[PDB]
Design a protein around this ligand. Structure first.
Ligand SMILES: O=C(O)CCC(=O)C(=O)O
Length: 346
């Protein structure tokens, strides 16, 4: 098998991108210049949610916060979080370390190569074609479990920069706390006990935090490819950071909306797991990522996922009734993932 990283292809001197990276004709019609799209202020915009009062002593103020979070989650399912409690310097340190790792040569990064054929999903890699089309996305990545700490395999984490492990682990611990805060607010939003949603996804002992650094090299024909294909996250919640280079787009009301870069914010997605549990109330929105020819884009996505086999995911009983039938049948996390593949594969 040949191993070709997009970064390599991006520096091979090609004037035109390979066929496998060009999207089908129908999809190309919706892809425009990300910088032009970013400028547009017409149409629905991704909501910005202020979490400053999420756990305020002032009941009225707190409920307002929770209500805003609930409304955005029920409508968009995606939002820019601000005053989320994660120190700005910590986020800056995480992004710096990520940029430094990817600044290494492809050859250096290959020392961390994952190996899907043997189940070693962690490490440096790129999406392998998984269906008849053979479609590929303009992206390279680094993937690894980040929390709980006892489940980590630190031996595969980048040794360059020297503080990768320190900054990343600190960031993971902080995100785990924020996740608990969001889960409680979302639980209350559904009229459930505060601790319900987090418990349903595994709690502190089984909920996993996976870190995926997405590297999008400059692309010569940016409008013919995608950094990330259109899809929904299967996680319960996803928290994302990026290097202030636009690219994220959301499929809202049948149109592709471009997310604007909000300083010090953290993008948060409601994932399939919460959408299933809430019986469709909280939305796991379809989204994709655009690349460009001017700047390298990098994003840091941490997926908060339930154990893959231990929990059967289905709408919670409180969310189902004769008038509100189940919008999803029961499936474990692993079975849901396979079912979505089965859909595209077929
Ligand atoms: O680059 C981004 O903004 C997010 C990438 C993404 O969709 C993912 O990691 O699932």
């Amino acid at each position: 098998v040949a191993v070709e990283r997009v970064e390599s292809l991006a520096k091979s001197g090609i004037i035109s991108i390979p066929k496998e990276y060009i999207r089908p004709k129908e999809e190309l019609e919706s892809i425009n210049d990300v910088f032009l799209e970013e400028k547009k202020e017409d149409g629905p915009q991704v909501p910005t949610i202020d979490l400053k009062n999420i756990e305020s002593d002032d009941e009225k103020i707190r409920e307002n916060c929770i209500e805003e979070l609930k409304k955005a989650s029920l409508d968009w399912g995606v939002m820019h979080l601000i005053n989320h409690g994660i120190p700005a310097d910590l986020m800056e340190r995480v992004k710096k370390a990520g940029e430094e790792f990817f600044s290494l040569s492809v050859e250096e990064k290959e020392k961390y190569a994952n190996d899907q054929a043997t189940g070693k999903i962690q490490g440096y890699g790129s999406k392998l074609a998984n269906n008849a089309s053979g479609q590929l996305e303009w992206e390279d990545y680094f993937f690894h479990l980040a929390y709980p700490e006892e489940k980590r395999d630190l031996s595969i984490w980048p040794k360059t920069p020297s503080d990768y492990i320190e900054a990343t682990s600190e960031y993971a611990k902080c995100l785990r706390l924020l996740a608990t805060k969001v889960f409680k607010a979302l639980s209350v939003g559904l009229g459930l006990e505060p601790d319900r949603l987090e418990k349903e996804v595994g709690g502190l002992e089984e909920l996993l935090l996976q870190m995926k650094i997405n590297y999008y090299p400059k692309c010569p024909q940016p409008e013919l490819a995608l950094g990330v294909e259109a899809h929904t996250d299967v996680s319960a919640l996803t928290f994302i950071l990026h290097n202030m280079v636009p690219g994220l787009q959301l499929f809202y009301e049948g149109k592709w909306v471009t997310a604007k870069c909000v300083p010090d914010s953290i993008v948060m997605h409601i994932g399939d797991t919460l959408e299933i549990l809430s019986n469709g109330k909280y939305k796991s929105i379809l989204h994709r990522g655009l690349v460009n020819k001017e700047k390298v884009r990098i994003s840091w996505a941490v997926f908060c996922e339930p154990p893959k086999d231990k929990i059967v995911l289905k709408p919670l009983p409180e969310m189902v009734s004769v008038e509100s039938p189940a919008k999803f049948p029961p499936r474990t996390f692993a079975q849901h993932i396979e079912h979505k593949l089965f859909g595209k594969e077929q």
